[PDB]
């Protein structure tokens, strides 16, 4: 996250770190046994880390649970990033409390102008590299579809939205991928892609979760 603020320990209780020896992507806990992330975060050998603030220090609220199954969306396209969504089943259920909690799926899509919270452990610089150890947060609005398409001609599908600031300076970045965009207490987006970080006229692009609720629910019910 570029241009954000330190969230505070366990203030974003649905935020996950995906670990394969190191943090590589975020995710969101949607019930005691399932996480949603980006398909471009797929790899084998995932450990899901819940209850994290500092990802390099054991602080006492963590739960570390291996994945048993990963399911990439059937229509994910790695070239265009259309349908950039994945489900991960945990080997055992997490223990839910005030610091480790699920986030609700949306019943309706959010409109442009809605303010959302984006979080992650990604790079905090737009030029150069500095990775934080504690969770960072950013408040940002959903942008109109017209502004999004004008920023990325030919690249925005109906399964994507833009959020952020056209003036630049505040955005998600490398290492935030897969993490949550929460608006009015519901998971509306997944950190997906952009051109660089925090550049003028190049806001972040997010997977539009409201288009996937039926697939999520049916997949969880049968796996
Ligand atoms: Ca920790």
- Residues at the binding site for Ca(2+) are 52, 54, 57, 62
Among all chains, which residue has been given the structure tokens 């609700």?
A: 104
Tokens encoding 137: 């947060």
Catalytic status, residue 145: no
Distance between CA atoms of 185 and 178, rounded to whole angstroms?
A: 18
C-alpha 57 to ligand 1 mean position (Å): 4
Q: Which residues surround ligand 1, an ion (CB under 5 A)?
A: 52, 54, 59
Q: How far is the CA of 128 from the centre of ligand 1 (A)?
A: 25
Token pair belonging to 114: 């809605």
Architecture of the domain made up of 13-102+211-222: Beta Barrel (2.40)
For residue 84, indicate whether it is catalytic: yes
Query: What is the Cα–Cα distance from 30 to 103, expressed in whole angstroms?
Result: 5
Give the pairing of strands 63-72 and 86-90: antiparallel
What is the distance in A from the centroid of ligand 1 to the CA of 81?
31
Catalytic member of 40, 102, 176, 192 = 40
Q: What angle do CA 219, 216, 29 make, to 5 degrees?
A: 110
Catalytic residue status for 73: no
Q: From CA 168, how far away is CA 126, in angstroms rounded?
A: 10
User: What resolution does the deposited structure have, in angstroms?
Assistant: 1.0
Cβ(178)–Cβ(41) below 8 Å: yes
Catalytic residue among 53, 73, 84, 102: 84
Give the distance (Å) from ligand 1 centre to CA of residue 212: 31
Using CA atoms, how far apart are residues 87 and 178, in angstroms rounded to an integer? 11
Domain coordinates of the chain in residue numbers? 1-12+103-210, 13-102+211-222
The phi, psi pair for 137, rounded to 5°, reads -130, 155
Q: Contacts for 19-22 with beta carbons within 8 Å, 24 or more apart?
A: 19/46, 19/47, 19/48, 19/49, 19/64, 20/45, 20/46, 20/47
In the sheet that holds 186-193, the strands lie side by side as 5-6, 136-141, 115-120, 180-183, 186-193, 204-208, 160-163
Q: Which residues are annotated as a binding site?
A: 52, 54, 57, 62, 171-172, 174-175, 177
Q: How far is the centre of ligand 1, averaged over its atoms, from the C-alpha of 173 (Å)?
A: 21
In a 10 Å sphere around its CB, with 0-12 CB exposed, 13-18 middle and 19+ buried, how is residue 113 labelled? exposed
């Amino acid at each position: 996250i570029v241009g954000g603020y330190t969230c505070g320990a366990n203030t974003v209780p649905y935020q996950v770190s995906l670990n394969s020896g190191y943090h590589f992507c975020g995710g969101s806990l949607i019930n005691s046994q399932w996480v949603v992330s980006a398909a471009h975060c797929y790899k084998s050998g995932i450990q899901v880390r819940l209850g994290e603030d500092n990802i390099n220090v054991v602080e006492g609220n963590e739960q570390f649970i291996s994945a048993s199954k990963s399911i990439v969306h059937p229509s994910y396209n790695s070239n265009t990033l259309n349908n950039d969504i994945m489900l991960i089943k945990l080997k055992s259920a997490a223990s839910l409390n005030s610091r480790v909690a699920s986030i609700s799926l949306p019943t309706s899509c959010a409109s442009a102008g809605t303010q959302c919270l984006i979080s992650g452990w990604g790079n905090t610089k737009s030029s150069g590299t500095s990775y934080p150890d504690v969770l960072k947060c950013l408040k940002a609005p959903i942008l109109s579809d017209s502004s999004c398409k004008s920023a990325y001609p030919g690249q925005i599908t109906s399964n994507m939205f833009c959020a952020g600031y056209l003036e630049g300076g505040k955005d998600s970045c490398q290492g935030d991928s897969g993490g949550p965009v929460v608006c009015s207490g519901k998971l509306q987006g997944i950190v997906s892609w952009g051109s660089g970080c925090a550049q003028k006229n190049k806001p972040g692009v997010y997977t539009k979760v409201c288009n996937y609720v039926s697939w999520i629910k049916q997949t969880i019910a049968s796996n």
